[PDB]
């Protein structure tokens, strides 16, 4: 029974432990559907940087310098795997 | 007909279940995550979501290995400095619990909800 | 066997295992290994017990081992029928769930927070690890107060003729509150004969039998110990209470209040009012208001 949009994927309970990693105590049942949105729109803008390297490459296959390219661009640069 | 017996009373006293008050859980959860280092969202759902998404820009991407875990610990420090700032947010109106009008209003101040 | 050496035993244990059916020889380790066993679980069972049942609180029944041979602990379990634990003693397997769980209090197995003291049943000596009721059995003094009647560490008495009517019993020593003191011992009789023994006893004002629970009576007009002399009273310096221990129901005695040297001891019988005024009408009080 899986599938389904994989957005439901991301279970409550992990969205759970984050808000604990960024000490948060209390939350409300609203949060886990925007955290969703909030976190799916996060993702539009790399995925759409990261193909538009790859494919001005040529390349079918996403690598992983391509990730740090983009994410460097949205100003929140990667330490730790290339460049 | 009954004698008068001697009797003393009886009683059947027993444990009590133990349950923490609330909260208390996740203030014991905060140090632990706090000083834990590993991926909080379970590992596959991730490949097949992204897989999902990056379908409608492009058709048949192979995705490396590699590059994969990336967008999880981008998106993860993403997602925890953006519940950091948010608590701030809700204890300034006095409150203890986040709702989401907060987290609107945070990524607002930062300039990324225009 | 020192009529044979080694040979001849084993060429005879060949010639009897030739002869006989060979032993069956089998192990076995049960599913569960540990952990899957939290004591809240329990918890659960007794609540469930309490509330179908023993929310009563009147049906005391004397423990009887029930047999599982091949059954579970099911609800036709003897002992759940009974509103009671299994004991070690019933064949409910060592993953029974009706059974004690063990009576680890730290200090001394002997106030409100040991659930054993909660509880009516004695800390066993082979539960109550923490409070030293398993160590030193052959010593007097331990660490635990509710390990003392397996141990029998009563207290010297004194018989007296009491102030209040004919022989009475009297301390030696002093003690404190809720210390305990000599066992109320007796002969088991059913709750019938007690009728009639006690319909004999009202014929001349005696009484020497005891409800020790809903199905028996203890009587120490013949077979008994000093205390059965003890006289009544209505502000007692001392109270009778019910206890379990080793499957076995007993009723000891403990100070109500802290006590010095030569008391006279009382407790309060406990009958009906109007039996009170039958039998134990004398006070012995002044009203100093
Ligand atoms: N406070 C009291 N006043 C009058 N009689 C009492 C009494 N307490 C106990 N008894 C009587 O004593 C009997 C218990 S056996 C004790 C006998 C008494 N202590 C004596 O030596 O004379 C009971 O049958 C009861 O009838």
């Known amino acids: 029974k899986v599938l389904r949009d994989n957005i439901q994927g991301i279970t409550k309970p992990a969205i759970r432990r984050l808000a604990r990693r960024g000490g948060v105590k209390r939350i409300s049942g609203l949060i886990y559907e925007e955290t969703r949105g909030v976190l799916k729109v996060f993702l539009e803008n790399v995925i759409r940087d990261a193909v538009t390297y790859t494919e001005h490459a040529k390349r079918k296959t996403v690598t992983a310098m391509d990730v740090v390219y983009a994410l460097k661009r949205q100003g929140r640069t990667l330490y730790g795997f290339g460049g | 007909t009954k004698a008068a017996r001697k009797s003393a009373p009886a009683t059947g006293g027993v444990k009590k279940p133990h349950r923490y008050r609330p909260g208390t859980v996740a203030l014991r959860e905060i140090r632990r995550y706090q000083k834990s280092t590993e991926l909080l969202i379970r590992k596959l759902p991730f490949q097949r979501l992204v897989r999902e998404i990056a379908q409608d820009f492009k058709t048949d991407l192979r995705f490396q290995s590699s590059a994969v875990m990336a967008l999880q610990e981008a998106s993860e420090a993403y997602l925890v400095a953006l519940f950091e700032d948010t608590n701030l947010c809700a204890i300034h109106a006095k409150r203890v619990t986040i709702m989401p009008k907060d987290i609107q209003l945070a990524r607002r101040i930062r300039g990324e909800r225009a | ?124 000596p082979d539960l109550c690890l923490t409070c030293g009721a398993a160590d030193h059995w052959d010593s007097k003094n331990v660490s635990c107060k509710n390990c003392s009647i397996q141990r029998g560490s009563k207290k010297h008495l004194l018989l ?116 009170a005024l039958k039998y134990v009408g004398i006070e012995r009080e002044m009203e100093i208001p």
């Open chain 3, 1 to 124: 066997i020192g009529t044979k050496t080694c040979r001849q035993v084993y060429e005879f244990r060949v010639k009897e295992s030739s002869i006989i059916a060979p032993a069956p020889a089998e192990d076995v380790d049960t599913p569960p290994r540990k952990k899957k066993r939290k004591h809240r679980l329990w918890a659960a069972h007794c609540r469930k017990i309490q509330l179908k049942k023993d929310g009563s609180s009147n049906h005391v029944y004397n423990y009887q081992p029930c047999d599982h041979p091949r059954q579970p602990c099911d609800s036709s379990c003897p002992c759940v029928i009974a509103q009671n634990f299994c004991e070690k003693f019933c064949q409910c397997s060592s993953e029974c769930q009706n059974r004690f769980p063990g009576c680890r209090c730290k200090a001394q197995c002997n106030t409100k927070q040991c659930p054993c003291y909660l509880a009516v049943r004695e800390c066993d």
């Open chain 3, 160 to 275: 007296a003729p009491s102030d209040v009517a004919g022989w009475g019993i009297f301390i030696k020593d002093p003690v404190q509150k809720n210390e305990f003191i000599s066992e109320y011992c007796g002969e088991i009789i059913s709750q019938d004969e007690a009728d009639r023994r006690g319909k004999v006893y009202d014929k001349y004002m005696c009484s020497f039998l005891f409800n020790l629970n809903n199905d028996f009576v203890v009587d120490a007009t013949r077979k008994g110990n000093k205390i059965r002399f003890a006289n009544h009273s209505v502000n007692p310096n001392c109270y009778a209470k019910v206890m379990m221990v080793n499957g076995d129901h007993r009723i000891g005695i403990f100070a109500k209040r802290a006590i010095q040297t030569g008391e006279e001891l009382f407790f309060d019988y406990r009958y009906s009012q109007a039996d």
